[PDB]
Amino acid sequence: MVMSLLGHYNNFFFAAHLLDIAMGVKTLRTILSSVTHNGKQLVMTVGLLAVVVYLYTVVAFNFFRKFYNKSEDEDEPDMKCDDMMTCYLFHMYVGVRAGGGIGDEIEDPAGDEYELYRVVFDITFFFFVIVILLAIIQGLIIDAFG
Amino acid sequence: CTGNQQSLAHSRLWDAVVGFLHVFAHMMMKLAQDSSQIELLKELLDLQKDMVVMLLSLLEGNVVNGMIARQMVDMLVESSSNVEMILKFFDMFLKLKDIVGSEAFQDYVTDPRGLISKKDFQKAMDSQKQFTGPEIQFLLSCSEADENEMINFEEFANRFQEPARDIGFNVAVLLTNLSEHVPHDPRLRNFLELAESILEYFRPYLGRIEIMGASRRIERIYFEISETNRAQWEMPQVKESKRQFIFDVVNEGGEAEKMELFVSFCEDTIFEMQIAAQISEPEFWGELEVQRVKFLNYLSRNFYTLRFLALFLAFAINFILLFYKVSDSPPGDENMVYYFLEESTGYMEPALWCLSLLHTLVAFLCIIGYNCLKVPLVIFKREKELARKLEFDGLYITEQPGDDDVKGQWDRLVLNTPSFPSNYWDKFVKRKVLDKHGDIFGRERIAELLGMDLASLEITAHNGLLTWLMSIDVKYQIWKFGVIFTDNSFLYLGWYMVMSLLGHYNNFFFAAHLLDIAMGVKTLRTILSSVTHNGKQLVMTVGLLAVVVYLYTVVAFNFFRKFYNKSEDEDEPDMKCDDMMTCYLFHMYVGVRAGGGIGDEIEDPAGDEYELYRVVFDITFFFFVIVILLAIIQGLIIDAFGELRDQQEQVKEDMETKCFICGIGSDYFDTTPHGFETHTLEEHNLANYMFFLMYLINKDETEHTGQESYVWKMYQERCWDFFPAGDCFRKQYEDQLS
Amino acid sequence: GQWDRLVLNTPSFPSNYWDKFVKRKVLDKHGDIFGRERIAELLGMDLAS
Amino acid sequence: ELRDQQEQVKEDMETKCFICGIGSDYFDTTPHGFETHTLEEHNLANYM
Ligand SMILES: Nc1ncnc2c1ncn2[C@@H]1O[C@H](COP(=O)(O)OP(=O)(O)OP(=O)(O)O)[C@@H](O)[C@H]1O
Ligand SMILES: Nc1ncnc2c1ncn2[C@@H]1O[C@H](COP(=O)(O)OP(=O)(O)OP(=O)(O)O)[C@@H](O)[C@H]1O
Ligand SMILES: [Ca+2]
Ligand SMILES: [Zn+2]
Ligand SMILES: [Zn+2]
């Protein structure tokens, strides 16, 4: 009722009533219940993912700072990792939505005296995050629903 | 002894007991009205306790409908006129103790010394209709009450509680035994109803053990559970250890050895309570020593809170470290200074500097607390296992270690040491093994191996700047240090402290403590365990993937070299595959991180005389790697995690249909309401068995009952035939004689 | 449990429950061992007078 | 399922007798009862 009242102030507030009452049906009621079913595990797994990516951010900030360049206009630097907050935000935002981890977005390490270290960095980021932690979260949600 | 039991049954003992009950019941009332002959009353109660002990002994091996039980119940119903007085004497003082200290009774006291001011004690006792006129008169008479009102309820209520506790417990045990053996007797129901006030009082103290009896039948055992033995059993650091023990026994314990593991757990938790006994708060050179001893107890008694404090410190340090910034110039070539981004307050840097120090201090305190708390447990377990291997299944005399386990070879060091059983209770294991194996094998060689003095020196028991610098067992200390360093928890704490120290060299080394201690929680602990659960399969699947990628690398190197070009700048070639190492690195690095295999990165083969071959190459690479091997690895990890989570629930749901001791749990005992709960909480309770073991250990050998001596003798020789088999005294007697 | 303490000592506590004599039942059950006057004050019913 | 079939055969013995049928619902009432019935009376190696 409160949001129905608020919908007169702005007509777009009636959109939430499309979702909030569609769950009153039987089939879609358990979809939301699945999220809160493993509530004590979802938040903790997300925290573990955040800690892991934080460790990767620390490693990248200390050593691989020169690779995080995202502009070529003679105003080149655009350093994604020149601040711990900025590097962590870059790793959060697009380091997991990418299909191959953080290695897809950064430049190639071919012949930069750190090629093996950065190859290990990218491979272990991909393996430990994309194909492990995301799969664990997916399995938690789907198994709770099942 | 059946003959003597029948001889006393068919004798004049019953008349003597009746007369004794009469005189005791009358003298208990007579002696309590003056508080001058208190010692005589205490001695009288002791003699009553001895008589009740004799009566209980008369019912040692009685059949459910035994003749001796019926004779005893006839004896009690013959002298009911005095048993009622005894029960009322107990109940009235129990009710007086309960009433005193409440609110209704406290509403009458107005004096400031704690005096009820007699002539208002009667009103206070009459407001709550519990006693009668004569009972209140008797209570008034038993009080001191000088100057016509001086009844000190604080001492009056507690005067008769301690002396009458033993006799009350003994008569409660006797009544419980008689009621549980002959239930079809209305002449005992009135006795039970009149004794409900003492029976309900000794509810938590009265144990109930069912054992395999001496000859052929299940017998019930009643004993006393000390208040301290139950207070320490309810400690938070005990329930989780019990749950871990059940987890291990149910999953990886199997059968035919459950009782041995249970007894070992009972001894381990007895040692745990022994450790916790001296950890309680009450507990020139001498003052410093006692102060140091007192100081080294706050860390041990409060050790997990230090772990939480270290976790909080690590989180705060990492949050502070999140503000680091790098620039080519100082805030005021290739400098690259790592300075701090002070947003609005300059106190962030001193806060980081201080937190770095307290983190290391807390880590050192944590490792000290672990050393003073959980190391004696593992030392005791190792010593006990070694001693019981030596004296029962001798491993360094008859057999030898198989050279495959480092534990057996390392345990050879602690032998021939003057202080080998420093933590184990048994200090005479060397003499036991010498007397057991010193005849078939060389007595002198066994004495040399165990390092004890020969029979010439130690024949029989005929009878600190220097102590801490000369009286040290170097060999024992080396063995203990090796055992401690082999422990996983000690290694983890040592690594924690080492990296805390290293964090002062570079502030970024505190980041690992963010992850390594977050796994101490329950939910995230199995996430890492899943990786090593399928350890023998993960590495091998990764090796298979590497071999497949190597085969594709060979095929690409031989034929499809011209396609691997990754530059267009008139310095074109940039051949990724012109060297087998480079081609393999290109395929492994980005051939699996791509969503469509290696075909996405290389150039198109459209119209190049190899279009079909390269199309097959790309399609089979994609299908065989991306959608098969990666899926297999993912399934391995997720299935290991799921089965690890499911094993934690299988052990939690297995008890609800099975009995931990006698076998069948709920297909025969749940036929009555709360039937499984009764069978668990009354007859077969593992905590009750542990309490019985503690009671036997604490009790003197000369005071052991026949069943207690039988159980103790079987325990000393490590035979568990006294534990209930698939029988619970109800399939034998209560099946027909309900 | 803490919020249920407000509904006590109310003239119309069992407004929906069928049993309107629960106060008298608990007074007759626990009014002897504990204070009858204090129980009446806690449950807010008129005293026996 | 290939991995699970290799585990089902490793747990069917622990409740059934390879020769006479019933394995543990009648012989485990005594301690080491299944072990005795396997190692003394009905042993396939002994039949070989
Ligand atoms: N001797 C026993 N025989 C059979 N089952 C038992 C025995 N002792 C305990 N159990 C099982 O354990 C249950 C109670 O013990 P458990 O420790 O599992 O639970 P809890 O008392 O709620 O836990 P806790 O005290 O550890 O917090 C019983 O309901 C029963 O299923
Ligand atoms: N005749 C039998 N009847 C029933 N079960 C049997 C019989 N023989 C063997 N078993 C089962 O097999 C188990 C022992 O044989 P098994 O080969 O499976 O194990 P193992 O001796 O540890 O292995 P191995 O000797 O092959 O290394 C017994 O515990 C029982 O479960
Ligand atoms: Ca004796
Ligand atoms: Zn049982
Ligand atoms: Zn068989």
Curated annotation (Swiss-Prot), chain B:
Residues 504, 558-580, 601-620 are lumenal. It is found in: Sarcoplasmic reticulum membrane. ATP binds at residues 239-243, 655-660, 680-686. A motif (Selectivity filter) lies at residues 595-601. Changing T526I: Decreases threshold for channel activation by K(+), caffeine and 4-chloro-m-cresol. Decreases inhibition by Mg(2+). Detected in skeletal muscle (at protein level). Fast- or slow-twitch skeletal muscle. The modification Phosphoserine is found at S567. Residues 371-480, 522-536, 642-738 are cytoplasmic. Residues 103-131 form the EF-hand domain. Ca(2+) binds at T702. The N-terminus is blocked. Residues 581-600 dip into the membrane without crossing it. Caffeine binds at W425. The chain crosses the membrane at residues 303-323, 350-370, 481-503, 505-521, 537-557, 621-641. Belongs to the ryanodine receptor (TC 1.A.3.1) family. RYR1 subfamily. The calcium release channel activity resides in the C-terminal region while the remaining part of the protein constitutes the 'foot' structure spanning the junctional gap between the sarcoplasmic reticulum (SR) and the T-tubule. Pore opening is mediated via the cytoplasmic calcium-binding domains that mediate a small rotation of the channel-forming transmembrane regions that then leads to channel opening. Binding of [3H]ryanodine indicates that the heterozygous channel is activated by Ca(2+) concentrations 4-fold lower than normal. Single-cell analysis of cotransfected cells shows a significantly increased resting cytoplasmic Ca(2+) level and a significantly reduced luminal Ca(2+) level. Homotetramer. Can also form heterotetramers with RYR2. Identified in a complex composed of RYR1, PDE4D, PKA, FKBP1A and protein phosphatase 1 (PP1). Repeated very high-level exercise decreases interaction with PDE4D and protein phosphatase 1 (PP1). Interacts with CALM; CALM with bound calcium inhibits the RYR1 channel activity. Interacts with S100A1. Interacts with FKBP1A; this stabilizes the closed conformation of the channel. Interacts with CACNA1S; interaction with CACNA1S is important for activation of the RYR1 channel. Interacts with CACNB1. Cytosolic calcium-activated calcium channel that mediates the release of Ca(2+) from the sarcoplasmic reticulum into the cytosol and thereby plays a key role in triggering muscle contraction following depolarization of T-tubules. Repeated very high-level exercise increases the open probability of the channel and leads to Ca(2+) leaking into the cytoplasm. Can also mediate the release of Ca(2+) from intracellular stores in neurons, and may thereby promote prolonged Ca(2+) signaling in the brain. Required for normal embryonic development of muscle fibers and skeletal muscle. This is Ryanodine receptor 1. It comes from Oryctolagus cuniculus. The gene is RYR1.
